[PDB]
Nucleic acid binder design. Structure first.
Ligand SMILES: Nc1ccn([C@H]2C[C@H](O)[C@@H](COP(=O)(O)OP(=O)(O)OP(=O)(O)O)O2)c(=O)n1
Ligand SMILES: [Ca+2]
Ligand SMILES: [Ca+2]
Ligand SMILES: [Ca+2]
Ligand SMILES: [Ca+2]
Ligand SMILES: [Ca+2]
Ligand SMILES: [Ca+2]
Ligand SMILES: [Ca+2]
Length: 903
DNA sequence: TCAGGTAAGCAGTCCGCG
DNA sequence: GCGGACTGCTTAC
């Protein structure tokens, strides 16, 4: 097999590499790697190396890496550019793996672990590590086993061994419901003392040294705790055995308002799943506890226990251990679904970076581009210092707030990457500038044609047309990959709707789910068999279809993220290729493209309808347009349609056969106007929206920019079995809005769009009546909590104190003195509730850590003093009033002449 | 929240607005 | 009470 790296590190003048050899075995080597860097040289000097601008360079080969880094400093002292890859391990990987890496994940050791620490005096700080580690569960991907290290004897209590038999039994049998599928995979190791537990864990670690290290909060808690605890008990040299190269470093991670410490384990790639989830899931969660996320992702129940976690080991050691094992399993389950480890491996090996560098698109792109240029013996420029400067972004059209009955949307495929490719935007393709007219002049095609030679953006920039820049070349490769995975994603989605349709008529039979590849549209034969299947088999097929869709979504959306981040990186000072001329060339072209096609669509539809100066385009944001289709529907007449799906087919056919050709023509003209390299502005129909045929639903509405709702029947070619609400920006979409309120607002919107004013009034009346019964957590607001210190003045709010921070200060006074009370953590999220006047908390609100029940120290008083009225007005009534005013509807029945006529 | 970008919405504070 | 200047936070793209 072809060899591939596992990890790479620079330690002094040595590269330390863990790798898989040609025989599939894990090996480690120390290499005295001699790096090369580059200086510009005279034309008269014969060379094969040239910088990205075509200037000749001489290669300097150094005796060691220290010499190379020292040369860089001397070149800065002289004031001369020192060219080449200054991250020597990236250069090493480029030299060592000079081909497309094909990796075998089965040879990569992926370790998933979690630890338990009993602590009576509050949260056990990793930096202190003053409490014993009393449980470790460590899953190994190669062995496919959960290794359980269980401390039976502690200063905080001596316990009996964990029982696998009881662990397996149902909660109803007194058991812990450890999943049957993992019971046989548990290797249980009890220990009479902590010293032996940790010594065995390190011996284990040495035998089965993780390559990829993951878990939940491992980088911020588990790793530093284990390292510091071993350090405290045994000394530094023993703790450094967690590194295969015996090297560690305390790394200080700085944010805006403080800093934290992590332990860098050289020769290991830590991918904390919380951090993978935050980057790659495209969610914003009210809480990032494993319990909350596992519930969200897997629909598994909350792991319940009696009393505080600080007494769980002593009171119920059996459950304590079972829950530690289950915690490790839940992270594996989330990954089976989301596949973020797979993604990280794919992207890391593609770029030829340390796997953990996938968190940094700048590092990722720097290596992709470096490897690409190296192939041509081209030499990358030195990174330079830049002051942070603001620059303009996208255009957003101000909508007229209103109801909108029939709507069709259109959207540009991968806009910013498509602009990069069309215009040929790259560091080395800059040809010059032209004299810019106001953007409105380009939009309306009155401005002089910018160039007859070069490819242009309305920001004034001109680019070469003779060859693709390295940025367009490399962005195109990842774009193509993204497009492939999106195809699989959409097929799985369409296949899912086929199954949902069939679930209307399930057959009374005992059968099996079909063995199919959900990434491909179901054949007629598969469709015929599906119509004969039971609900059990169909539901099993639906779950698998939905899993396939998720897998495709991860692969596609994060590749989309990676390519969009290249456009963004051009506007980040730490990028080697930072250039606001290029960054602004992209964004300014985008603004033109949107407003250009707005005009073309308006012109086309005015012609088709035989009118003049009427606005068909009602809204647009960045690269999308929303077109009012009322007149189109009216031109055939609503009474001519057999059902909803009939007018949806008509609009679909109209969008594809009439509008898209007009849009294409409009963009081809714009391409020629800017003299671009290649026409790549592809704007396809996205949504077809409207009320159900024969209903009083309003179809859709806008309240303002980035705030709208649509009742959608078809999205990017997926025809839904049931109409889907597309809601953007409204409170239903905000993590800060209470859970029950999001749900209630969504139902109000559903009623508005699908059923009408009366149905909405019926629901509002009921919600207002019953909402005081809702669980306090489901009606609590959520907020991130930053700068708690800044606004704390003797436990009381300082000037300008934010509402949620006030809540926290209130909480802090109420729990004053309690070491065991849950503390609000700076930078994390809190639930927030308003409090009625004259409450014993001495203020108008209280806030506690999100995803948790408020401590029983104060739970009864909060419940008793919760301000339900304020809560309802602020989170529910005010947003609804916004929705209904925009839609020109009333959420409460107005008085009419008909009342009353009853005798 | 260490880790690509800008536009823009709403909550809330402070305080003016005769 | 509304809105303007501002901070805070959270979305859409
Ligand atoms: N996180 C994001 C999302 C959007 N954008 C910019 C770049 C995109 O090209 C443009 C349009 O965003 P879309 O959400 O429509 O995504 P794309 O057009 O890039 O891809 P596609 O529409 O094919 O899914 O906005 C961005 O810079 N960063
Ligand atoms: Ca735990
Ligand atoms: Ca397993
Ligand atoms: Ca799209
Ligand atoms: Ca798009
Ligand atoms: Ca059937
Ligand atoms: Ca879009
Ligand atoms: Ca203070």
């Amino acid at each position: 097999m072809k060899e591939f790296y596992l990890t790479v590190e620079q330690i002094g003048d040595s590269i330390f590499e863990r790798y898989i050899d040609s025989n599939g075995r894990e090996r480690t080597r120390e290499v005295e790697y001699k790096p090369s860097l580059f200086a510009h040289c005279p034309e008269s000097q014969a060379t094969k190396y040239f910088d990205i601008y075509g200037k000749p360079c001489t290669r300097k080969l150094f005796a060691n890496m220290r010499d190379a880094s020292q040369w860089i400093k001397r070149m800065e002292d002289i004031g001369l550019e020192a060219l080449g890859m200054d991250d020597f391990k990236l250069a090493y990987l480029s030299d060592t793996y000079n081909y497309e890496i094909k990796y075998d994940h089965t040879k990569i050791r992926v370790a998933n672990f979690d630890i338990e620490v009993t602590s009576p005096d509050g949260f056990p700080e990793p930096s202190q590590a003053k409490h014993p580690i009393d449980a470790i569960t460590h899953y190994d991907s190669i062995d496919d086993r959960f290794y359980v290290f269980d401390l039976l004897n502690s200063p905080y209590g001596n316990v009996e061994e964990w029982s696998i038999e009881i662990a397996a039994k149902l909660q109803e049998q007194g058991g812990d419901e450890v999943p049957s599928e993992i019971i046989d995979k548990i290797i249980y190791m009890p220990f009479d003392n902590e010293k032996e537990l940790l010594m065995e864990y390190l011996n284990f670690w040495q035998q089965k040294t993780p390559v990829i290290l993951t878990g939940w909060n491992v980088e911020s808690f588990a790793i530093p705790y284990v390292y510091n605890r071993i350090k405290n008990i045994f000394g530094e040299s023993t703790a450094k055995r967690l590194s295969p190269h015996r090297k560690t470093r305390v790394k200080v991670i700085e944010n805006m308002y403080g800093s934290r410490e992590i332990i860098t384990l050289f020769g290991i790639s830590v991918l904390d799943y919380i951090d993978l989830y935050k980057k790659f899931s495209f969610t914003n969660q009210p809480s990032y506890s494993l319990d909350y996320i596992s519930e969200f992702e897997l629909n598994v129940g909350k792991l319940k226990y009696d009393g505080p976690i600080s007494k769980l080991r002593e009171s119920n050691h059996q459950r304590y251990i079972s829950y530690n094992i289950i915690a490790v399993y839940r992270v594996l389950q989330i990954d089976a679904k989301r596949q973020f480890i797979n993604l990280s491996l794919d992207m890391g090996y593609y770029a030829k970076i340390q796997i953990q560098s996938v968190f940094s698109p700048i590092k990722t792109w720097d290596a992709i581009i470096f490897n690409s240029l190296k192939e041509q013996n081209k030499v990358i420029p030195q990174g330079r210092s830049h002051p942070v400067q603001p620059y303009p972004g996208a255009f957003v059209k101000e909508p007229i707030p209103n109801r909108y009955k029939y709507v069709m949307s259109f959207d540009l495929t991968s806009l910013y990457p498509s602009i990069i490719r069309q215009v040929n935007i790259s560091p080395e393709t800059i040809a010059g500038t032209f004299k810019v007219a106001p953007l409105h002049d380009y939009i309306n095609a009155v401005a002089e044609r910018p160039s007859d030679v070069y490819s242009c953006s309305p920001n004034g920039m001109m680019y070469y047309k003779d060859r693709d820049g390295v940025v367009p070349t490399e962005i195109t490769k990842v774009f193509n990959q993204r497009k492939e995975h999106k195809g699989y994603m959409l097929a799985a989605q369409r296949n899912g709707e086929i199954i949902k349709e069939a679930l209307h008529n399930p057959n009374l039979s005992v059968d099996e789910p079909l063995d199919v590849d959900y990434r491909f549209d179901f054949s007629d034969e598969i469709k015929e068999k599906i119509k004969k299947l039971s609900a059990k088999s169909l539901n099993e097929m639906l779950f698998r279809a939905q899993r396939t869709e998720v897998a495709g979504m991860t692969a596609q959306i994060n590749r989309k993220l990676l390519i969009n981040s290249l456009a963004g990186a051009l506007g980040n000072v730490w990028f080697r290729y930072y250039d606001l001329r290029n960054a602004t060339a992209i964004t300014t072209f985008g603004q033109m493209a949107l407003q250009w096609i707005e005009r073309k669509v308006n012109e086309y539809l005015n012609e088709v309808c035989g009118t003049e100066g009427e606005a068909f385009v009602l809204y647009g944001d960045t690269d999308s347009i929303y077109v009012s289709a009322d007149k189109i529907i009216d031109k055939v007449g609503e009474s001519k349609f057999r059902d909803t799906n009939h007018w949806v087919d008509f609009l679909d056919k109209f969008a594809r056969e009439r509008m898209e050709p007009a849009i294409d023509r409009g963009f081809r003209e714009m391409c020629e106007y800017m003299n671009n390299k290649q026409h790549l502005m592809f704007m396809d129909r996205e949504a077809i929206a409207g009320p159900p045929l024969g209903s009083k639903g309003i179809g859709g509405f806008w309240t303002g920019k980035k705030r709208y709702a649509l009742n959608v029947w078809d999205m990017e070619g997926t025809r839904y079995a049931e109409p889907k609400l597309k809601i953007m920006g409204l409170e239903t979409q905000k993590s800060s809005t209470p859970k029950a309120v999001q749900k209630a607002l969504k139902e109000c919107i559903r009623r508005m769009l699908q059923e009408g004013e009366e149905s909405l009034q019926e629901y509002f009346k009921e919600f207002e009546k019953e909402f005081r019964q809702l669980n306090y957590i489901s009606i609590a607001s959520v907020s991130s909590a930053n700068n708690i210190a800044k606004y704390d003045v003797g436990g009381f709010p300082g000037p300008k104190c934010p509402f949620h921070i006030r809540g926290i200060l209130t909480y802090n006074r109420a729990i004053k003195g309690n070491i065991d009370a849950p503390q609000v953590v700076e930078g994390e999220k809190v639930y927030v509730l308003p409090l009625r006047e004259g409450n014993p908390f001495g203020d108008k609100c209280i806030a506690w850590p999100s995803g948790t029940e408020i401590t029983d120290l104060i739970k009864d008083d909060v419940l008793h003093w919760m301000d339900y009225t304020v809560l309802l007005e602020k989170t529910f009534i005010k947003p609804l009033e916004g929705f209904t005013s925009a839609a020109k509807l009333d959420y409460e029945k107005k008085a009419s002449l008909f009342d009353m006529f009853d005798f």
